[PDB]
Design a protein around this ligand. Sequence first.
Ligand SMILES: O=C1O[C@H](CO)[C@H](O)[C@H](O)[C@H]1O
Ligand SMILES: [Mg+2]
Ligand SMILES: [Mg+2]
Ligand SMILES: [Mg+2]
Ligand code: NA
Ligand code: NA
Ligand code: NA
Ligand code: NA
Ligand code: NA
Ligand code: NA
Lengths: 211, 1015, 174
Amino acid sequence: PNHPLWYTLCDRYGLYVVDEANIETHGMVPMNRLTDDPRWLPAMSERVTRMVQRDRNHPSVIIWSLGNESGHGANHDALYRWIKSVDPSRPVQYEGGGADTTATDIICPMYARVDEDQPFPAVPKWSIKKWLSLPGETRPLILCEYAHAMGNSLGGFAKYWQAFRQYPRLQGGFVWDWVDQSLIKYDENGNPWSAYGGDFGDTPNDRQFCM
Amino acid sequence: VVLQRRDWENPGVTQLNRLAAHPPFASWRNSEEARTDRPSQQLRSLNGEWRFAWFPAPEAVPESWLECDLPEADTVVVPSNWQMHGYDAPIYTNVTYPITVNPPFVPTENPTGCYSLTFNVDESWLQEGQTRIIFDGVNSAFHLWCNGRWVGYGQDSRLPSEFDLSAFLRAGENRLAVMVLRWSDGSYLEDQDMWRMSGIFRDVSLLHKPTTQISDFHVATRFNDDFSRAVLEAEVQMCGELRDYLRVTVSLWQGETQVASGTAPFGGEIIDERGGYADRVTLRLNVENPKLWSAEIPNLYRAVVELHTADGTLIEAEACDVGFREVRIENGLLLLNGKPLLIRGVNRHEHHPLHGQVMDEQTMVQDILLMKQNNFNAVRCSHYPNHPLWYTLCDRYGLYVVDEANIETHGMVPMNRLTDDPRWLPAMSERVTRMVQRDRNHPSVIIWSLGNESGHGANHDALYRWIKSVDPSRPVQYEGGGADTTATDIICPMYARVDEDQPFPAVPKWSIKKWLSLPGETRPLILCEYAHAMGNSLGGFAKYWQAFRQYPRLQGGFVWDWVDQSLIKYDENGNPWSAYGGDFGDTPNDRQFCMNGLVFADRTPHPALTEAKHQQQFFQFRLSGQTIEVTSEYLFRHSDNELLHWMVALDGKPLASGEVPLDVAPQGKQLIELPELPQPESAGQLWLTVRVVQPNATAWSEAGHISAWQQWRLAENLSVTLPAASHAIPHLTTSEMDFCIELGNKRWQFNRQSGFLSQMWIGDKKQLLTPLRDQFTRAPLDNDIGVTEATRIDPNAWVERWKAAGHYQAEAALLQCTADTLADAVLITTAHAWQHQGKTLFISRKTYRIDGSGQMAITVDVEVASDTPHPARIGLNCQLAQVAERVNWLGLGPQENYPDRLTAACFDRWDLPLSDMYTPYVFPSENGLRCGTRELNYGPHQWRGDFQFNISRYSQQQLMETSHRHLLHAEEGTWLNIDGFHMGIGGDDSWSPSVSAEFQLSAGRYHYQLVWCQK
Amino acid sequence: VVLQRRDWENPGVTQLNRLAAHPPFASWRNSEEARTDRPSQQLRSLNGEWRFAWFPAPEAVPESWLECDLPEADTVVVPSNWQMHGYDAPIYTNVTYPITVNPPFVPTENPTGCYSLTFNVDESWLQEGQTRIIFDGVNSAFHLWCNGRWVGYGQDSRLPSEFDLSAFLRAGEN
Ligand SMILES: O=C1O[C@H](CO)[C@H](O)[C@H](O)[C@H]1O
Ligand SMILES: [Mg+2]
Ligand SMILES: [Mg+2]
Ligand SMILES: [Mg+2]
Ligand code: NA
Ligand code: NA
Ligand code: NA
Ligand code: NA
Ligand code: NA
Ligand code: NA
């Protein structure tokens, strides 16, 4: 959840907002180790429920998200249903565990390609065009993350937009991301420079991957 | 920190340092011991004598108690509830919380139980591995100390709390200290309609596991379309250091035969982008033609889970009973193994009249045996997880179980105030999740329930989905918020009636037949509670069973309930008696409302149990000419232990009999042709009675057990022969105050001022102590009373309508009393009016004809004002001088039966001791009626006609005035009530009028006739 | 008992004495001010300069800090991330946790930021009504004291934690 003023400005300027719970357990092995554990359900529930209690009156918020990169656990299903019960006015989405689980109203993959399948075991990233028409599948598809804009990038961006325009159920996506997470440091002359992972003695670190 | 934090007033803290929940463990170190389910050396019982001290509040517990014993403390058996030892009072309240409603706070005066134990621990237990303590039930919250050091904290009275004592223990002698709080924030979720007690009331044990251990295992069984093939899937979890040499073997046994086995190293399938569970393994075993589990045949396999090295060194084995069965809802029907169930259920609390809420194996087994013997196939764990052994016994004996989370918030306003509040979601979640984790491997559990009477809140929807996600093998149900909410797979109302709608705002109870077909509704309907069996009840039980059999999607229900929650108290002479709400100085209380059982607290059946048995029969019968058609309602079994015995009797006199083995496939039919029956010249009604007998003993019944019966009227020959003309003529004698009739050694006296027969003599011995008078009232049943009290009158209750109308106060006013001498008889004619404050309620017009044969024919014609509440009965009563040993009657019996509860009773000649003609309901009322009676014999007296009667040493007045059965005293002689007509007893519930229109005495005019003579 | 319970190593304790969550409030006492979304006298910003001291662990925090200002402490702008003032280093890691994966435990060496503020309140706030403090964002967990007395505890770095201070406040300086 963002600083409260953000939602006010999105209401007034006009942007559609996906409001997302402060839950990411990416580093767990497997990714759902905590989110499938009922002992972590209370901590997880407060991050979801208290977000809804705070932001439910903002028109700019159109979709609730259960968080990010925490696999798919039974806790997600419980909290999915909690939101569906308390606020039927907004769809609930969540990408974890393969982007099309029972805890999401929207097929919301990250970095699924336009034409190319990436058939990873358990959590494949199908071609977005192919994903829509898998046997039994009826949901809309909106990428929670796509077109990773790291450095000299956005090659093939036009391919997404052609597909979005052609396919009714391909309803777009969210570019990753808005702003480089570089920090200002100063050299011996007091001149400012842009710093990334590792430049603060921080180790281990993931270098320029924050930009 | 303990007194400072006050964790018992914080719904955010339900435990501290408590271990994860899991299925039953024993940590066998020998696979054969695991297979046979013999005792484990690694599982020690701490069910011995403990030290106990009672304190008014936790602030009153001295710090010295943590280190050493208190000398003031006593030595008490554990498990126990401390109220049962007399330390404080058990409280009976229904809905209203026993504490002020101020969540999460409890009273500052909070009865505190200080338990302690000094015990030996062998060195071997501490050298290697993990030693844990298991508290199966602590009501309602507790802190734990080991050797002076604080271990942890736990809430939820009805699930085990486990703590690691490895670092706390020493070799030789150790000491445990348990501070048990009566009230906590957990009490807000424990508002079940039952005695409020406290203490360590379930088993305490120590469990030794190796460091490298089985920490969890789940068993699933999936099937092909015709159940001829199964896959058993066992997920196994380990704790400790992961090693390449580690293996799990899951083996499946049928007796001493191994049927299947699987071995694998640890390392589950890839699950997401970060891999899989390295500490888990899933074993898959094929089983061809599995023997299927059901309540009909509880076929079980044994699964042994061995944790071992690749080379075959056993580390430990755990085990469980496996029942191969599939539970699913398809096309609106609940199916077991592909077949639609008919639930013959009962709700059962864990209650013992001496030990309170402590369960023992003997009582559990006693209950299961009686249940199955009375045609029950299902039990609801109202309203909490049970003692672990219960599920084992249900697995093995064969009963379907609804396992229900320990959550009831009935007393909140509105009912969902806590369950719709996300701040209470963590506490609720643990009561659901830890139940599922414990019980998921028991085949007897077929349905999960989210609790009871907590309204419908968002927390229910979340937890409904959690169960659906973690365990798709069982439907989830919940009644709160109107019984058909989004949190239930089954429409599961309580006390919804068969035909009658009850359209309450927001939460209507529709007629069950109507509910099924409401627009858009497709789910099965099974009542979580119906036929409230409080006192003289179960009127209209047959109506439910007719509907269940007719409607596919009406798949039965659970009777409320199994056993009276009465408690033993002792009088000044040390004699035991049954007590209910308020008898312990507990206030506020809900009096007798804790006693709703089919059996008394000591498991003696109420009369209603036989009505339940008959209606829940598994064989249905039809008669056509000489052909009996038997239909089986078994879904799985053939009738391989059943014979049909038939008997034809003329007014109780046996004419012919025989037996035919039953050979009926499940759901099949068998035609049985009766032989030619010789037509008796003698007058009367021929009756056919059939019964299904089990020739062989079973695990649940004795040889010769009767499982089903039915009766039909056959040919009737009406009597047309005139009685022999008498050579004597009765003589009439008249005074101002009496009409007297004399014939031989017999005399009748009619009082001319009262207009009643005041006395009768046989050889100058008086026969009456009280005159023969009309009676229109009964000592009110629990169903007549409802929730009415002196403090707050419910004007709608039958008793209150009768009282307000003056039915109990109404005095007979004589209108006419004449005597006429006839050719061979004396005729007495009378007329009476019963009036209250100017209003005539009833008129009784009678003739008494005494002939030369000594017989007195009584003809009664009664008028009842259309605008007075329909009367409880229309009959006569008197107090006879005679006290005789036996009661002999031709009519319905042998047990107590009422107009809306007489289907189980059979027409025949019955002969019982007088005491059996009285039903010792703990709260006294009208009781012991027998209907459809054509002849009654008592001492020298015989009454003939077509009447209902009861007979006992207690007047209706005394029954009405006495609140406990132990306070009743036998009156002089015998009170006889002979009714032409009697109102139904009802019982669809016991808090509103429930007697159906067809059983109300609303006809306005009534006629009956009796002949009184000397036997 | 704060150091003894270690609420920051217990996923069963995510708060203590925290008020219920709700939509943005300003408690206007004038309907027209509410309509126009103009400032409310009942909603006061504490975004001013605070006193701050960095510690390597909660065990290193002296008990005297509860009662009075540490002279070694600095005056800093709040809201702030203390890494941006140079007290310790910001860490950039993607997937791998910045701490050893051993739930629910965290490193014993646990950088602790001790924030303090001396302030006064309107006299009318002491006589009637309810005064709460709202922390819109605290990363990652915190204990709160008012006038030497323990108030509560909060987790979740990205939602407001609110606590009732009505029974803790006094006339003059707090
Ligand atoms: O509705 C109910 O009726 C019963 C009345 O005896 C009893 O209180 C049950 O616990 C409750 O669920
Ligand atoms: Mg608590
Ligand atoms: Mg209740
Ligand atoms: Mg914590
Ligand atoms: Na589109
Ligand atoms: Na990045
Ligand atoms: Na049915
Ligand atoms: Na009851
Ligand atoms: Na047979
Ligand atoms: Na009575």
